[PDB]
Amino acid sequence: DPEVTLLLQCPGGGLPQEQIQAELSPAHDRRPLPGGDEAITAIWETRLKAQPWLFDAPKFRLHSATLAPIGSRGPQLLLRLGLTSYRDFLGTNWSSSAAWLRQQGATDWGDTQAYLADPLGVGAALATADDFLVFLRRSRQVAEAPGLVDVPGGHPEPQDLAGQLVVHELFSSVLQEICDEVNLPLLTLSQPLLLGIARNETSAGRASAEFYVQCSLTSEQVRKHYLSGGPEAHESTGIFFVETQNVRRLPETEMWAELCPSAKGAIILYNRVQGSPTGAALGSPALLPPL
Numbered sequence: 001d002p003e004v005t006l007l008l009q010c011p012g013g014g015l016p017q018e019q020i021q022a023e024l025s026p027a028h029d030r031r032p033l034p035g036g037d038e039a040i041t042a043i044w045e046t047r048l049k050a051q052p053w054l055f056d057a058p059k060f061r062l063h064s065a066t067l068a069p070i071g072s073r074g075p076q077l078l079l080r081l082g083l084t085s086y087r088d089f090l091g092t093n094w095s096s097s098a099a100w101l102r103q104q105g106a107t108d109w110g111d112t113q114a115y116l117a118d119p120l121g122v123g124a125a126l127a128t129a130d131d132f133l134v135f136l137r138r139s140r141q142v143a144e145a146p147g148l149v150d151v152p153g154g155h156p157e158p159q160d161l162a163g164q165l166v167v168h169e170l171f172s173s174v175l176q177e178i179c180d181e182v183n184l185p186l187l188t189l190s191q192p193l194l195l196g197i198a199r200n201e202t203s204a205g206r207a208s209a210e211f212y213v214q215c216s217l218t219s220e221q222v223r224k225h226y227l228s229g230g231p232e233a234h235e236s237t238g239i240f241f242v243e244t245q246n247v248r249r250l251p252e253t254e255m256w257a258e259l260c261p262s263a264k265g266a267i268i269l270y271n272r273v274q275g276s277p278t279g280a281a282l283g284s285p286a287l288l289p290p291l
């Protein structure tokens with residue numbers, strides 16, 4: 001899977017909100033482009049002159065994420081964040097020249113991402129009460145990953161002492177994205193655990209935080225909620241469910257070729273962090289069948 005790279009695998013089965021620190025600093029921003037940010041402005045102008053209803057939005061930028069020594073007390077992860085925008089993404093990660101920007105950032109800064117917007121996405125491995133994960137089918141008419149399978153998620157918008165409010169907005173955003181797209185009541189959802197961070201190499205290395213969320217409804221009840229919104233209550237064109245039993249071997253299935261990169265990152269991290277038992281009971285052959 002060359003289109004996805006793991007930046008972070010969390011310990012302990014995944015980290016809760018209370019164990020994560022953020023540092024939000026202009027030192028973590030994109031570097032101005034070599035020949036100036038006028039190249040971003042030009043792309044944006046061209047786009048607005050064809051689609052004048054489009055609007056910019058701020059986004060969080062991922063600079064880096066450092067894990068504490070495993071087994072330690074205190075905060076377990078430090079997220080280094082800056083600010084970016086949808087406009088800066090369209091002018092850098094989405095540009096035809098994005099690979100040239102990656103080479104120049106290696107030359108100039110020793111950092112392939114230094115000239116890239118790299119907005120932080122969020123995604124969920126969302127489990128039902130009857131042990132299925134939730135999948136969504138993408139419209140064949142959108143610009144990004146048309147017609148491919150996704151998981152719930154999105155790209156959160158801004159508004160350890162500004163840090164803790166930023167970590168709160170990241171965790172809140174993955175629940176809000178599940179309520180808005182799957183049409184689930186907020187009180188049917190567990191507090192999220194962070195599983196890790198995955199990069200999309202087809203989008204010049206932009207990263208997504210991947211979370212585990214448990215729902216108290218069965219697959220049948222989740223389907224009813226999604227569908228009862230009607231076609232205008234969701235951006236996706238369909239919902240479907242895979243038993244957690246069968247997610248273990250998903251990369252060997254014909255489904256794997258239809259998964260978008262950020263959904264592949266969610267399923268690899270689910271399998272490594274929530275799957276893959278370490279203990280004698282769950283690791284016994286009748287409960288963890290070989291192969």
Ligand SMILES: Cc1occc1C(=O)Nc1ccncc1
Pocket residue numbers: 021066067068069072073074075076077078
């Ligand atoms: C990544 C991180 O975020 C906040 C603190 C740390 C960290 O590394 N903590 C630590 C270092 C050394 N011994 C024990 C714990």
